[PDB]
Design an enzyme around this catalytic site. Structure first.
Site, PDB file in Angstrom:
ATOM      1  N   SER A  40      -8.375  -0.756  -0.787  1.00 54.88           N
ATOM      2  CA  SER A  40      -9.340  -1.742  -0.300  1.00 54.88           C
ATOM      3  C   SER A  40     -10.199  -2.274  -1.439  1.00 54.88           C
ATOM      4  CB  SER A  40     -10.092  -1.171   0.887  1.00 54.88           C
ATOM      5  OG  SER A  40     -10.842  -2.200   1.558  1.00 54.88           O
ATOM      6  N   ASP A  86      -4.799  -5.273   9.974  1.00 55.57           N
ATOM      7  CA  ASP A  86      -5.862  -5.194   9.000  1.00 55.57           C
ATOM      8  C   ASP A  86      -6.277  -6.634   8.742  1.00 55.57           C
ATOM      9  OD1 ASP A  86      -7.467  -4.885   6.723  1.00 55.57           O
ATOM     10  OD2 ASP A  86      -6.042  -3.606   5.634  1.00 55.57           O
ATOM     11  N   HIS A 102      -6.185  -0.769   8.746  1.00 53.04           N
ATOM     12  CA  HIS A 102      -6.853  -0.605   7.471  1.00 53.04           C
ATOM     13  C   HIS A 102      -7.256   0.858   7.337  1.00 53.04           C
ATOM     14  CE1 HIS A 102      -9.073  -2.187   4.088  1.00 53.04           C
ATOM     15  NE2 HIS A 102     -10.038  -1.300   4.378  1.00 53.04           N
TER      16      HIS A 102
HETATM   17  C1  LIG Z   1     -12.898  -1.930   3.761  1.00 47.75           C
HETATM   18  O1  LIG Z   1     -12.268  -1.162   2.713  1.00 47.75           O
HETATM   19  C2  LIG Z   1     -13.051  -0.462   2.024  1.00 47.75           C
HETATM   20  O2  LIG Z   1     -13.058  -0.602   0.834  1.00 47.75           O
HETATM   21  C3  LIG Z   1     -13.786   0.544   2.900  1.00 47.75           C
HETATM   22  C4  LIG Z   1     -14.980   0.102   3.512  1.00 47.75           C
HETATM   23  C5  LIG Z   1     -15.765   0.943   4.283  1.00 47.75           C
HETATM   24  C6  LIG Z   1     -15.316   2.216   4.563  1.00 47.75           C
HETATM   25  C7  LIG Z   1     -14.117   2.666   4.018  1.00 47.75           C
HETATM   26  C8  LIG Z   1     -13.315   1.863   3.201  1.00 47.75           C
HETATM   27  C9  LIG Z   1     -12.036   2.529   2.705  1.00 47.75           C
HETATM   28  O3  LIG Z   1     -11.058   1.789   2.507  1.00 47.75           O
HETATM   29  O4  LIG Z   1     -11.997   3.803   2.541  1.00 47.75           O
HETATM   30  C1  LIG Z   2     -13.665  -3.817   1.769  1.00 48.74           C
HETATM   31  O1  LIG Z   2     -14.335  -4.775   0.929  1.00 48.74           O
HETATM   32  C2  LIG Z   2     -14.617  -5.914   1.532  1.00 48.74           C
HETATM   33  O2  LIG Z   2     -14.219  -6.196   2.635  1.00 48.74           O
HETATM   34  C3  LIG Z   2     -15.549  -6.751   0.718  1.00 48.74           C
HETATM   35  C4  LIG Z   2     -16.577  -6.100   0.048  1.00 48.74           C
HETATM   36  C5  LIG Z   2     -17.519  -6.816  -0.662  1.00 48.74           C
HETATM   37  C6  LIG Z   2     -17.408  -8.177  -0.736  1.00 48.74           C
HETATM   38  C7  LIG Z   2     -16.391  -8.840  -0.065  1.00 48.74           C
HETATM   39  C8  LIG Z   2     -15.435  -8.149   0.659  1.00 48.74           C
HETATM   40  C9  LIG Z   2     -14.330  -8.985   1.313  1.00 48.74           C
HETATM   41  O3  LIG Z   2     -13.108  -8.661   1.091  1.00 48.74           O
HETATM   42  O4  LIG Z   2     -14.676  -9.987   2.010  1.00 48.74           O
END
Ligand SMILES: COC(=O)c1ccccc1C(=O)O
Ligand SMILES: COC(=O)c1ccccc1C(=O)O
Ligand SMILES: COC(=O)c1ccccc1C(=O)O
Length: 295
Positions: A145, A239, A269
């Site tokens: 992610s 996702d 996801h």
């Molecule tokens: C959304 O993907 C992330 O980077 C993320 C955001 C919040 C909680 C967990 C995650 C993950 O991919 O572990």
């Molecule tokens: C999991 O990370 C995101 O979804 C995110 C985090 C910070 C800024 C933008 C994003 C995105 O993918 O919109």
């Protein structure tokens, strides 16, 4: 193609407090499906933005000739070496790779592009150490992610930064903060990663809303992907980030980059840090098979 039965069952069920709750969730799942024993060593890398805590994983038997540098996900706000231990331990033991798990600086305390710089610094450190570990001095970057974002941007910056990267492993990465995709519209709510949270993550990480169009925030926007490191891009069918991940794989492939693209059907996801799903180990097997093809 229907929602995985176990995923279905799972969905049906302050900043410090939220980080802790996220960490408690991660521990619960590891308690349910314990990780393989693995030798580890903690350390600290000196980066251009300060010390960055790392954890090196040593496989029982070394079978892969490049170090992996792994950047955890969590929207740039959450997560740490411990939340991702379940994944990284299996990557280490299943691939037979030394893995550097990285605790880059989290937002909002640190803001874009601080973690990008840190992640480059750590990759450069790993490349320099690699000959003394009896490994090749070219690294494999990896992340889930937000961590996948970091891995993709590190790969794009690699040549400019004189960084030898042998491959990039992107696990349901975030790559495009500018564009709405069909998956981002269609799976906006109810599949663990939600539009509300993604917006909030952006508010924490980015300096200004204009940062969304910066190539170190949105690597999918780089017009030239020629000569980038061989890529494994794993997506989940349900996702919001799916479409941007697949489109990036498609663009890499059209740019002549050796690319393997795998959609895990029925999945959501985050599944590669959710060991309650057998698909997590299947995806880790995918990684080992992909890495077998790398020189
Ligand atoms: C959304 O993907 C992330 O980077 C993320 C955001 C919040 C909680 C967990 C995650 C993950 O991919 O572990
Ligand atoms: C999991 O990370 C995101 O979804 C995110 C985090 C910070 C800024 C933008 C994003 C995105 O993918 O919109
Ligand atoms: C919470 O982070 C950790 O568990 C960790 C593990 C090894 C090295 C450093 C750290 C850290 O505090 O980031």
């Amino acid at each position: 193609m229907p929602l995985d039965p176990r995923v279905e069952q799972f969905l049906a069920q302050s900043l410090a407090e939220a980080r802790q709750q996220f960490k408690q969730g991660a521990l619960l799942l590891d308690q349910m499906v314990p990780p393989p024993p693995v030798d580890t060593e903690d350390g600290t890398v000196v980066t251009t933005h300060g010390p960055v805590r790392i954890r090196r994983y040593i496989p029982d038997r070394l079978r892969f000739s490049h170090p992996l540098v792994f950047y955890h996900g969590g929207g740039f706000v959450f997560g740490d070496i411990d939340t991702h231990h379940g994944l990284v331990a299996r990557l280490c033991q299943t691939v037979g790779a030394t893995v550097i798990s990285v605790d880059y600086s989290l937002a909002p305390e640190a803001k874009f592009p601080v973690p990008v710089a840190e992640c480059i610094d750590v990759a450069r450190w790993a490349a320099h150490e690699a000959p003394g570990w009896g490994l090749k001095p070219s690294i494999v970057v990896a992340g889930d992610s937000a961590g996948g974002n970091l891995a993709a941007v590190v790969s794009q910056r690699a040549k400019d930064e004189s960084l030898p990267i042998a491959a990039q492993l992107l696990f349901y990465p975030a790559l495009d903060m500018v564009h709405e995709t069909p998956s981002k519209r269609d799976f906006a709510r109810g599949y663990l990663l939600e539009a509300d949270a993604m917006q909030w993550f952006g508010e924490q990480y980015l300096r200004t809303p204009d940062d969304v169009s910066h190539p170190w925030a949105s690597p999918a926007l780089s017009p030239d992907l020629t000569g980038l490191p061989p890529a494994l891009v794993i997506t989940a069918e349900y996702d919001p980030l799916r479409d941007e991940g697949e489109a990036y794989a498609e663009a890499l492939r059209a740019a002549g980059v050796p690319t393997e693209q795998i959609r895990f059907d029925g999945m959501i996801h985050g599944f590669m840090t959710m060991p309650i799903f057998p698909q997590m180990e299947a995806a880790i097997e995918a990684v080992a098979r992909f890495l077998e093809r790398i020189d």
